[PDB]
Amino acid sequence: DVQLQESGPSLVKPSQTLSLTCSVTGDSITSDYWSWIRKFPGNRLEYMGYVSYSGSTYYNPSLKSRISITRDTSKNQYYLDLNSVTTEDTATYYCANWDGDYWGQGTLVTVSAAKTTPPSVYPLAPSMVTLGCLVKGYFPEPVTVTWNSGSLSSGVHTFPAVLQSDLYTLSSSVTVPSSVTCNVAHPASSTKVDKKI
Amino acid sequence: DIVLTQSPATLSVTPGNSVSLSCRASQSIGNNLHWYQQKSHESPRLLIKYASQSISGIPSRFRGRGRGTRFRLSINSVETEDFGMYFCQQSNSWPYTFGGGTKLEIKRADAAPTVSIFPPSSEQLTSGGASVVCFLNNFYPKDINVKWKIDGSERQNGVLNSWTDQDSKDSTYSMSSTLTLTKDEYERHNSYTCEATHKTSTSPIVKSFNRNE
Amino acid sequence: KVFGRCELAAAMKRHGLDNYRGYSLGNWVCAAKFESNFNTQATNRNTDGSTDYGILQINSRWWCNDGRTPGSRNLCNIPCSALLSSDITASVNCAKKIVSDGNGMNAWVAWRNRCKGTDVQAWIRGCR
């Protein structure tokens, strides 16, 4: 068994270098071939590259001149370096094994010159009763919104965020018995806000 | 560089029927085609490897067929849990390439939206706030239309909409609509109406927030 | 099971090894011949204390786990029993991984010594 975790910036500036890290737990990185794949906003998947047992690294010709895949046996990790990034390199990045059966969770990377913005959190209250939480005016994406630290999750609907020029606005609904806290986290600004009804 | 084109791009199926998904290659790739399933909130899931080989645990209703330049993934007696995107990948030549995807949508019985309207929060109103939220939850089919009319009179300039995909519990969709105003504008008018047009209703579904009342 | 030239060739073309990462079928037929003599149950023990298993004599210190090579890297993530079957499925998928490294078919000593630089199509000429 192997567990994979991607780690890296959510906002990178254009013309600069993207760096990512795939941490591997459970088994050594000497037990497989390891690869990087990205999914662009249009749901288009691109195999970025893989590293083999001999240390041979294979790179997509499209990115060959700007990509480097490196390894660290000391830390059981491998790394991705993409140089000269542009706004078209904004995507979700996945590390995975060459077999393609063990994948990471994904790390969203936005390439923009826009500035990081913390979110404003507002409560939404008026058979069953529905409450809500508005996360307005933030950058970049993503944010994570849970209800009562995830205990209330079956009746939760967090809506994908919509962009307004330079800021994102998101809504989340929770349905609860007649018979409650909204927890919002923005990693890129390191903000953690809890709001009740 | 092998080009993979997948077809159709979107298909809707009544649970219990069989579907076939096609992946075509720009050059012969033998049997080196793999099929993946990606649902919402999930990393790609390998379903078929080397284009007919099964994967432990994956239902036998998934079948792989094909060799050369034309391949196919068959889902017999499609079930509700098979909604998602479907990708094909080749491994015969480097760079390893993917297909464009096929979104599978599960047909369901019609469901009326559960509409809930929420006034601007006092915390928001302290700033140039005044953003009324409407939640239209758990509805099928996807076809929906929302109009905001503040005092009886439609406004569509400050409206922002977002929608979820099929849910992992009831196979329905959900929607959020937000009318953003200024606190001035909000205080000057009184009524706030959220109107929905769905197949489940014969006249608009209205939920209103009356400041006066 | 022991394979024939044309039989192995056909099976390896049905398993999509013809031009996998550029290597024609003949390369694989040649390698299999000089590695196991088309024997699906061929086993060879090495100095490491490892075993070579199957039609393509795949090592247990690097590519498969037998429970008898400690410190195996199991790069093909498979048991070594599957390489000893009359079905060549596992041997083929593993060799596809072995060849997808930068060394290529230079991981098979036989291939390096007896097939590299030769008309390997001769090992499929005659088969239909």
Author numbering:
A (entry chain H): 301 to 426, 434 to 486, 493 to 510
B (entry chain L): 1 to 213
C (entry chain C): 601 to 728
Task: Give sentences from the paper.
In this study, we introduced five arginine residues into an anti‐hen egg white lysozyme antibody (HyHEL10) Fab fragment to create the R5‐mutant and comprehensively characterized the interaction between antibody and antigen using thermodynamic analysis, X‐ray crystallography, and molecular dynamics (MD) simulations. Previously, we reported an affinity maturation strategy in which the association rate of the antibody toward its antigen is improved by introducing charged amino acid residues into the framework region of the antibody (Fukunaga and Tsumoto, 2013). HyHEL10 has multiple tyrosine residues which are involved in the antigen recognition as hotspot residues, Tyr33 and Tyr50. In conclusion, our results suggest that introducing the R5 mutation into the framework region of antibodies does not alter the overall complex structure, but it increases the conformational diversity of the CDR, thereby enhancing the antibody–antigen association rate.
To identify the molecular mechanism by which the R5‐mutant gained enhanced affinity, we conducted structural analysis and determined the crystal structure of the R5‐mutant antigen complex at a resolution of 3.0 Å. Although some residues in the CH1 region (Gly 127–Gln 133) were not modeled because of missing or weak electron density, the entire structure exhibited typical Fab and antigen complex geometry. The overall structure within FR3 was very similar between wild‐type and R5‐mutant complexes. The orientation of Fab and antigen was almost identical for the wild‐type and R5‐mutant. The relative position of variable and constant regions differed slightly between the wild‐type and R5‐mutant. This difference was caused by the change in the elbow angle, defined as the angle between the pseudo‐dyad axes relating VL to VH and CL to CH1 (Stanfield et al., 2006), that occurred from 148° to 122°. Because previous studies showed that the available elbow angles cover a wide range (127° to 220°) (Stanfield et al., 2006) and both wild‐type and R5‐mutant elbow angles were close to this range, the structure of the Fab and antigen complex did not change substantially after introducing arginine residues. Furthermore, orientations of side chains in each CDR loop, including Tyr 33 in CDR H1 and Tyr 50 in CDR H2, which are identified as hot spot residues (Shiroishi et al., 2007), were not changed by the mutation. In the present study, the crystal structure of the Fab‐antigen complex showed that the orientation of Fab and antigen was almost identical between wild‐type and R5‐mutant, indicating that the R5‐mutant maintained the antigen epitope after introduction of the arginine mutation. The k on value of the R5‐mutant was 68.6 times greater than that of the wild‐type, whereas the k off value was almost the same as that of the wild‐type, indicating that the arginine mutation mainly influenced association.
